[PDB]
């Protein structure tokens, strides 16, 4: 051994294990999925009720970076909201210097170069978080990006991060996200995260949904209660 202690050393076959070890820490966080509809992006996070003593609305794994940009995280939660602070701060420097709202192909570029910068030195560790960025503009449409702890970003029609990643994105491609608007998506977002996480592992869990598009007039916010109650009404019909 000895070839895997620092992030400054390659292996004798040419790969870095400190990044791969931090990628393994993501699959112990639960599940965060997000797909984009024809005219907007819908996030979705199932939230484990660890004990009864916590309060409904605690420790949200679903942030709010800018007025139109949303973030759903998966990983070590202290590093999640630390990456959320620099992304919230990066968009403020764009509007102050250039005058207008930051686009997603630039925002996820500036954040991923900040994540990549900790995969080079021995003085710092790689982050233990993977997360998704989605938004809607009236001149660019809906956007959906995703960033690993190594620093690689791509566009997606729908993605999934958490424990059951392949077992979640198997059913995403059963949908048709090219033509559905962001109303019937909300019922289909919830349904594919009820079929995952058998009740042997967890007793009870919490649904948390997010929502952006021109139906929300460009601003990012949470779903209302009645709409996610319709999805929770559309929960127990997967037993047939």
């Amino acid at each position: 051994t000895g070839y895997d202690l620092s992030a400054s050393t390659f292996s004798p076959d040419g790969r870095v294990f400190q990044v791969e070890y931090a990628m393994k820490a993501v699959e112990n966080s639960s599940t965060a999925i997000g797909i984009r509809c024809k005219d907007g992006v819908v996030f979705g996070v199932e939230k484990l009720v660890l004990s009864k003593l916590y309060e409904e609305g605690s420790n949200k794994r679903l942030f709010n970076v800018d007025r139109h940009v949303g973030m759903a995280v998966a990983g070590l939660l202290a590093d999640a909201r630390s990456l959320a602070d620099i992304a919230r701060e990066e968009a403020s420097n764009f509007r102050s210097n250039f005058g207008y709202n930051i686009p997603l192909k630039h925002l996820a570029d500036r954040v991923a170069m900040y994540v990549h910068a900790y995969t080079l030195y021995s003085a710092v560790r790689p982050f233990g978080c993977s997360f998704m960025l989605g938004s809607y503009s009236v001149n660019d449409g809906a956007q959906l990006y995703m960033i690993d702890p190594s620093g690689v970003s791509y566009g997606y029609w729908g993605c999934a991060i958490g424990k059951a990643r392949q077992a979640a994105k198997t059913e995403i491609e059963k949908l048709q996200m090219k033509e559905m608007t962001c109303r019937d998506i909300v019922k289909e977002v919830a349904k594919i995260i009820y079929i995952v996480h058998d009740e042997v592992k967890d007793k009870a869990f919490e649904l948390e949904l997010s929502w952006v598009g021109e139906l929300t007039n460009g601003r990012h916010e949470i779903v209302p209660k009645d709409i996610r109650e319709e999805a929770e009404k559309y929960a127990k019909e997967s037993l047939k």
């Binding site: 931090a22 003593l53 070590l76 202290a78 021995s122 003085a123 710092v124 560790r125 790689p126 233990g128």
Partner: protein, 238 residues
């Protein structure tokens, strides 16, 4: 174990051991229990001593007129975050002339303690902050941990032998959102007699109570004014 030395090094399983060892430091300090009603936030601590002639180490501290905290762990890092805590409250009062909200205070702590958990040769802060306070939204109970992960909760308990206190809080938390200040406190006082050996409980010199209230500034009660609260408890069933 060569993966067990510095905060920077990831485990091959993906769990940084230096953070997990600072969780062992908060499990060494004595227990304390915080809980809230609709209109109040009460936290109760249990002191310890070294000899019978030395005094008891206090744990409840006064941050502001509407925020108080309770510590668990090594006391030197507790005062390091306490002097950061007081400073961030009175400058917001200096700038905006308003009480700084509680949920916005704790996120400053979570960004404060996350920084030494990523550099090289920097320890985490071993500390056990239970925070009680007032926003414009009523009472709030917050706990932290040396993994820089703060939790929103309605009743928690941390310290040595605290799992027995959590089982008491789960089977009585349906009653907490209704009662006045009197039996809200002695609901929490029945949790501290749960986490003790079966012979000594509450001898008026090792327990402290702090309340912030809807028309009540944060007030600490110590070893004489505890006695009105402490009377009115039944004997331990055996």
């Amino acid at each position: 174990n060569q993966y067990d030395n510095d905060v920077t090094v990831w485990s091959p399983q993906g769990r940084i051991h230096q953070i997990e060892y600072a969780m062992e430091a908060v499990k060494q300090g004595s227990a304390t229990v915080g809980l809230k009603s609709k209109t109040h936030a009460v936290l109760v601590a249990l002191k310890r001593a070294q000899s019978e002639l030395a005094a008891h180490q206090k744990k409840i501290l006064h941050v502001d007129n509407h925020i108080g905290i309770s510590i668990a762990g090594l006391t030197a890092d507790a005062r390091l975050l306490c002097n950061f805590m007081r400073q961030e409250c009175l400058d917001s009062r200096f700038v905006f002339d308003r009480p700084l909200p509680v949920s916005r205070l704790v996120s400053l702590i979570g960004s404060k303690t996350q920084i030494p958990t990523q550099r090289y040769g920097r320890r985490p802060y071993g500390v056990g902050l239970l925070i009680a306070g007032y926003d414009d939204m009523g009472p709030h109970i917050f706990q932290t941990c040396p993994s820089a992960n703060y939790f929103d909760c309605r009743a928690m308990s941390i310290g040595a032998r605290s799992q027995s206190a959590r089982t008491y809080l789960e089977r009585h938390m349906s009653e907490f959102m209704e009662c006045n200040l009197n039996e809200l406190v002695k609901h929490g006082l029945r949790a501290l007699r749960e986490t003790l050996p079966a012979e000594q409980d509450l001898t008026t010199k090792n327990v402290s109570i702090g309340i912030v209230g809807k028309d009540l500034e944060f007030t600490i009660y110590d070893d004489d004014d505890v006695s009105p609260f402490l009377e009115g408890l039944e004997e331990r069933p055996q």
